[PDB]
Amino acid sequence: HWGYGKHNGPEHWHKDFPIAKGERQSPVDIDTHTAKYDPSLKPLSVSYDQATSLRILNNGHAFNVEFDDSQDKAVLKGGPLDGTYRLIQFHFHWGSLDGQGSEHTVDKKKYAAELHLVHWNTKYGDFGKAVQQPDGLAVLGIFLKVGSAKPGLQKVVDVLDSIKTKGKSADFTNFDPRGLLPESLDYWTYPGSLTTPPLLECVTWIVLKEPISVSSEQVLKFRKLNFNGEGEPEELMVDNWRPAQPLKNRQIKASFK
């Protein structure tokens, strides 16, 4: 099945998922000089005060922090979006080294990691229906650079020993995702896709310009996770990023000058 190895990685995915070669695939390189300011965009509205985290799961590709998405508790609105999008999970992509790991790039620069906060459009009732729609999802992408620790990330890092291998989950209640956001909500936006199979072209991407800082020690913990299940040969969960895809007939818009 698909993964991030030599025989199963991103250049292979098209064989099982031909949309991998589609018209609106993600991630992309954000060419900052060609993005255009769009004064009609709004500020984004990130309303996470009522968020209810439930569980953290090693799914063999990443770890997901899952939320209760059965009511409007943690929602994204505004910006480029029409309507209300509910937070379902967040996860990361990261590298084996600090010079790689992000999926989006900025002027070809790769960050150490990238956080995806995944939200679905409430007009479609559930996640599985939303991914079948061109405006089904909104993903807030946040770059990670290595420097000072991110205090709000530590409780995530804390629990990773308990979900080392694929298929392991742990209770993860009362986690506040506000502690993972940078100071500024300035962003770029464009229409794209899931960055993992099934690669569906259902995402409005909102990529924040300001990275968060995490410490070496925090990233190093990410890199101790395993892609394998328990009692299988150990293969470190690193370099779980898809590279930039062709922009094709898209314009990236900026919320800022």
Side-chain angles (χ1 to χ4, degrees):
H1 278 291
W2 71 270
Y4 296 95
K6 350 195 162 64
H7 298 275
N8 67 0
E11 309 314 308
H12 293 271
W13 294 352
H14 72 101
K15 292 173 279 170
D16 283 316
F17 306 93
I19 200 69
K21 299 180 185 266
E23 296 304 306
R24 55 171 287 184
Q25 289 289 292
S26 294
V28 298
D29 184 54
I30 300 166
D31 186 81
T32 66
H33 283 106
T34 60
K36 195 185 177 188
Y37 170 66
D38 185 348
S40 61
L41 289 165
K42 333 152 205 300
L44 279 176
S45 174
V46 183
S47 299
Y48 290 169
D49 48 288
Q50 299 290 117
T52 298
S53 68
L54 291 176
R55 193 176 74 137
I56 190 174
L57 174 67
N58 180 337
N59 60 23
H61 298 122
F63 60 86
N64 288 180
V65 174
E66 300 167 349
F67 291 78
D68 176 14
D69 66 349
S70 72
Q71 288 190 91
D72 286 349
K73 284 182 172 192
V75 301
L76 186 65
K77 300 175 50 72
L81 304 174
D82 285 323
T84 299
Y85 289 71
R86 283 198 190 155
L87 181 62
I88 180 169
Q89 53 100 334
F90 66 82
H91 67 275
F92 304 80
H93 302 269
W94 64 90
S96 49
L97 305 162
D98 295 350
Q100 62 196 55
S102 69
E103 295 205 306
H104 296 90
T105 59
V106 178
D107 300 330
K108 305 294 178 74
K109 177 192 175 65
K110 294 172 169 97
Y111 287 86
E114 185 174 332
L115 165 63
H116 291 167
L117 295 125
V118 180
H119 311 73
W120 56 270
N121 192 329
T122 64
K123 79 191 188 185
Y124 302 124
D126 67 68
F127 180 85
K129 286 290 194 282
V131 296
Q132 299 179 64
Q133 316 312 145
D135 60 350
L137 285 185
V139 184
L140 183 59
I142 305 178
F143 294 117
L144 282 58
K145 64 184 180 181
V146 172
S148 300
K150 192 67 167 177
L153 182 62
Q154 191 62 32
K155 180 173 156 187
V156 171
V157 165
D158 287 339
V159 73
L160 297 180
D161 277 342
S162 75
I163 61 150
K164 184 181 181 174
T165 50
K166 178 176 52 173
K168 287 195 164 320
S169 64
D171 287 320
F172 201 69
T173 56
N174 306 104
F175 180 80
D176 191 339
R178 295 176 293 186
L180 297 177
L181 300 178
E183 167 187 330
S184 180
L185 297 177
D186 291 342
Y187 65 88
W188 299 277
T189 184
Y190 73 95
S193 75
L194 306 178
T195 68
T196 48
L199 301 169
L200 295 168
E201 290 180 335
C202 60
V203 180
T204 302
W205 277 97
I206 299 166
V207 178
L208 299 188
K209 174 174 58 46
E210 193 181 3
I212 63 164
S213 293
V214 303
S215 67
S216 310
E217 293 85 5
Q218 289 178 319
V219 171
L220 283 161
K221 292 180 176 179
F222 287 16
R223 300 181 182 135
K224 296 180 61 180
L225 287 165
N226 286 184
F227 287 127
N228 59 279
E230 184 184 13
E232 298 175 348
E234 182 169 32
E235 187 57 11
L236 300 178
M237 184 181 283
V238 294
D239 296 315
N240 60 347
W241 52 276
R242 188 186 192 191
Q245 302 302 304
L247 188 61
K248 299 186 174 176
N249 184 223
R250 298 177 287 181
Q251 287 182 331
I252 302 183
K253 297 297 193 183
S255 74
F256 60 95
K257 317 200 58 147

Short mmCIF file of all heavy atoms in Angstrom, two decimals, residues 63 92-94 113 144 153 156-157 160 214 217-226 237-238:
data_model
loop_
_atom_site.label_atom_id
_atom_site.label_comp_id
_atom_site.label_asym_id
_atom_site.label_seq_id
_atom_site.Cartn_x
_atom_site.Cartn_y
_atom_site.Cartn_z
N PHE A 63 0.64 11.09 13.12
CA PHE A 63 -0.26 10.97 14.24
C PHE A 63 -1.35 12.04 14.14
O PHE A 63 -1.07 13.22 13.91
CB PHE A 63 0.46 11.01 15.59
CG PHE A 63 1.22 12.28 15.88
CD1 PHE A 63 0.54 13.34 16.44
CD2 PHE A 63 2.56 12.42 15.58
CE1 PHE A 63 1.17 14.50 16.69
CE2 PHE A 63 3.23 13.63 15.82
CZ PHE A 63 2.50 14.66 16.41
N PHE A 92 0.85 16.43 11.65
CA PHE A 92 2.06 17.04 11.14
C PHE A 92 2.68 16.20 10.05
O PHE A 92 2.48 14.98 9.99
CB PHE A 92 3.09 17.26 12.26
CG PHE A 92 2.61 18.07 13.45
CD1 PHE A 92 1.86 17.56 14.45
CD2 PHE A 92 3.02 19.44 13.60
CE1 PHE A 92 1.48 18.26 15.58
CE2 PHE A 92 2.68 20.13 14.72
CZ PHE A 92 1.89 19.56 15.67
N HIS A 93 3.54 16.88 9.28
CA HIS A 93 4.47 16.30 8.37
C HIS A 93 5.84 16.79 8.78
O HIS A 93 5.99 17.99 9.06
CB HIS A 93 4.16 16.71 6.92
CG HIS A 93 2.78 16.31 6.53
ND1 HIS A 93 2.45 15.11 5.93
CD2 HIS A 93 1.56 16.90 6.77
CE1 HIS A 93 1.17 15.01 5.76
NE2 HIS A 93 0.60 16.06 6.27
N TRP A 94 6.87 15.92 8.76
CA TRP A 94 8.18 16.33 9.21
C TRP A 94 9.28 15.53 8.57
O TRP A 94 9.03 14.54 7.87
CB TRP A 94 8.28 16.23 10.75
CG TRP A 94 8.14 14.82 11.29
CD1 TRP A 94 9.13 13.92 11.51
CD2 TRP A 94 6.92 14.17 11.64
NE1 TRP A 94 8.64 12.76 12.01
CE2 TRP A 94 7.27 12.88 12.09
CE3 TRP A 94 5.58 14.52 11.65
CZ2 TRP A 94 6.32 11.98 12.58
CZ3 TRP A 94 4.63 13.64 12.11
CH2 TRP A 94 5.02 12.37 12.57
N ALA A 113 8.95 21.20 9.49
CA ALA A 113 7.71 20.45 9.62
C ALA A 113 6.62 21.37 9.22
O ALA A 113 6.76 22.58 9.03
CB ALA A 113 7.54 19.86 11.06
N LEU A 144 6.63 24.89 10.78
CA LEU A 144 7.44 24.77 11.96
C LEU A 144 8.91 24.94 11.59
O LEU A 144 9.41 24.29 10.67
CB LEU A 144 7.32 23.41 12.63
CG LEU A 144 6.08 23.16 13.48
CD1 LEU A 144 4.77 23.30 12.74
CD2 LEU A 144 6.15 21.80 14.12
N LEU A 153 2.95 22.79 22.37
CA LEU A 153 3.18 21.51 21.74
C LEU A 153 3.61 20.40 22.67
O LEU A 153 3.50 19.23 22.36
CB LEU A 153 4.24 21.69 20.61
CG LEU A 153 4.58 20.47 19.78
CD1 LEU A 153 3.39 19.92 18.99
CD2 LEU A 153 5.72 20.83 18.84
N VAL A 156 1.55 17.24 23.42
CA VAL A 156 1.56 16.32 22.28
C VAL A 156 2.82 15.49 22.28
O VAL A 156 2.79 14.25 22.22
CB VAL A 156 1.39 17.05 20.93
CG1 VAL A 156 1.61 16.14 19.75
CG2 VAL A 156 0.09 17.79 20.88
N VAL A 157 3.97 16.14 22.39
CA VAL A 157 5.21 15.41 22.38
C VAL A 157 5.34 14.35 23.45
O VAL A 157 5.82 13.25 23.26
CB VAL A 157 6.41 16.50 22.60
CG1 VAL A 157 7.76 15.80 22.98
CG2 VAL A 157 6.54 17.29 21.31
N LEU A 160 3.69 10.87 22.81
CA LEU A 160 4.11 10.09 21.64
C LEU A 160 4.72 8.73 21.96
O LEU A 160 4.53 7.79 21.19
CB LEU A 160 5.04 10.90 20.73
CG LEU A 160 4.46 12.12 20.11
CD1 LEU A 160 5.51 12.84 19.21
CD2 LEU A 160 3.17 11.92 19.37
N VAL A 214 9.65 25.43 17.21
CA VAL A 214 9.66 24.30 18.12
C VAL A 214 11.09 24.00 18.41
O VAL A 214 12.01 24.35 17.67
CB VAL A 214 8.95 23.08 17.49
CG1 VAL A 214 7.52 23.45 17.12
CG2 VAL A 214 9.69 22.53 16.30
N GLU A 217 14.55 19.30 20.57
CA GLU A 217 14.13 18.15 21.34
C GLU A 217 12.70 17.76 20.98
O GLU A 217 12.34 16.57 20.98
CB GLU A 217 14.20 18.40 22.82
CG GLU A 217 15.63 18.56 23.33
CD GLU A 217 16.20 19.95 23.22
OE1 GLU A 217 15.52 20.88 22.83
OE2 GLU A 217 17.38 20.12 23.61
N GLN A 218 11.83 18.76 20.74
CA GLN A 218 10.47 18.44 20.33
C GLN A 218 10.40 17.69 18.99
O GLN A 218 9.74 16.67 18.86
CB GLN A 218 9.63 19.74 20.30
CG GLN A 218 9.37 20.25 21.70
CD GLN A 218 8.59 21.54 21.74
OE1 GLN A 218 8.80 22.47 20.94
NE2 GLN A 218 7.70 21.65 22.70
N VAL A 219 11.15 18.19 17.99
CA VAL A 219 11.17 17.54 16.67
C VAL A 219 11.78 16.16 16.76
O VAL A 219 11.31 15.22 16.14
CB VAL A 219 11.92 18.33 15.61
CG1 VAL A 219 12.09 17.50 14.34
CG2 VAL A 219 11.15 19.56 15.36
N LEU A 220 12.83 16.03 17.56
CA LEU A 220 13.47 14.76 17.72
C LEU A 220 12.50 13.71 18.22
O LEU A 220 12.61 12.51 17.83
CB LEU A 220 14.71 14.87 18.59
CG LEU A 220 15.91 15.44 17.91
CD1 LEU A 220 16.95 15.96 18.94
CD2 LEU A 220 16.59 14.49 16.89
N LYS A 221 11.55 14.10 19.09
CA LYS A 221 10.52 13.16 19.52
C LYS A 221 9.62 12.72 18.44
O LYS A 221 9.18 11.57 18.41
CB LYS A 221 9.89 13.66 20.80
CG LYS A 221 10.93 13.60 21.97
CD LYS A 221 10.52 14.05 23.32
CE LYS A 221 11.58 13.88 24.45
NZ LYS A 221 11.16 14.38 25.80
N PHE A 222 9.24 13.62 17.52
CA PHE A 222 8.47 13.21 16.36
C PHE A 222 9.21 12.08 15.61
O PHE A 222 8.56 11.12 15.15
CB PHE A 222 8.26 14.35 15.36
CG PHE A 222 7.28 15.45 15.72
CD1 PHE A 222 6.77 15.71 16.95
CD2 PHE A 222 6.95 16.40 14.72
CE1 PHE A 222 5.86 16.72 17.17
CE2 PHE A 222 6.07 17.39 14.95
CZ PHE A 222 5.48 17.54 16.19
N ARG A 223 10.50 12.22 15.48
CA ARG A 223 11.31 11.34 14.69
C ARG A 223 11.55 9.96 15.35
O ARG A 223 12.16 9.10 14.72
CB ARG A 223 12.65 11.98 14.33
CG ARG A 223 12.54 13.26 13.54
CD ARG A 223 13.89 13.81 13.21
NE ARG A 223 13.83 15.05 12.50
CZ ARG A 223 14.56 16.14 12.76
NH1 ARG A 223 15.51 16.09 13.68
NH2 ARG A 223 14.30 17.27 12.17
N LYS A 224 11.09 9.79 16.58
CA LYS A 224 11.13 8.47 17.26
C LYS A 224 9.94 7.62 17.00
O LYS A 224 9.94 6.44 17.35
CB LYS A 224 11.36 8.65 18.74
CG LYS A 224 12.66 9.26 19.17
CD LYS A 224 12.84 9.42 20.70
CE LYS A 224 12.80 8.10 21.44
NZ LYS A 224 12.98 8.28 22.88
N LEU A 225 8.89 8.21 16.42
CA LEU A 225 7.71 7.41 16.04
C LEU A 225 8.09 6.42 15.00
O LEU A 225 9.14 6.46 14.35
CB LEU A 225 6.63 8.35 15.54
CG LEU A 225 5.94 9.18 16.61
CD1 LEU A 225 5.18 10.29 16.00
CD2 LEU A 225 5.06 8.32 17.47
N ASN A 226 7.22 5.40 14.82
CA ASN A 226 7.41 4.37 13.85
C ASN A 226 6.22 4.30 12.83
O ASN A 226 5.09 4.43 13.16
CB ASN A 226 7.45 3.00 14.54
CG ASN A 226 8.71 2.66 15.32
OD1 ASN A 226 8.74 1.47 15.82
ND2 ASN A 226 9.69 3.50 15.48
N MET A 237 9.36 6.91 11.58
CA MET A 237 8.39 7.79 10.93
C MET A 237 9.04 9.15 10.77
O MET A 237 9.04 10.00 11.64
CB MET A 237 7.11 7.90 11.74
CG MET A 237 6.02 8.73 11.05
SD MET A 237 4.51 8.89 12.02
CE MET A 237 3.79 7.27 11.73
N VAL A 238 9.71 9.29 9.58
CA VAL A 238 10.36 10.55 9.18
C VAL A 238 10.14 10.69 7.68
O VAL A 238 9.88 9.76 6.96
CB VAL A 238 11.90 10.54 9.45
CG1 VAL A 238 12.20 10.47 10.93
CG2 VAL A 238 12.61 9.40 8.74
#
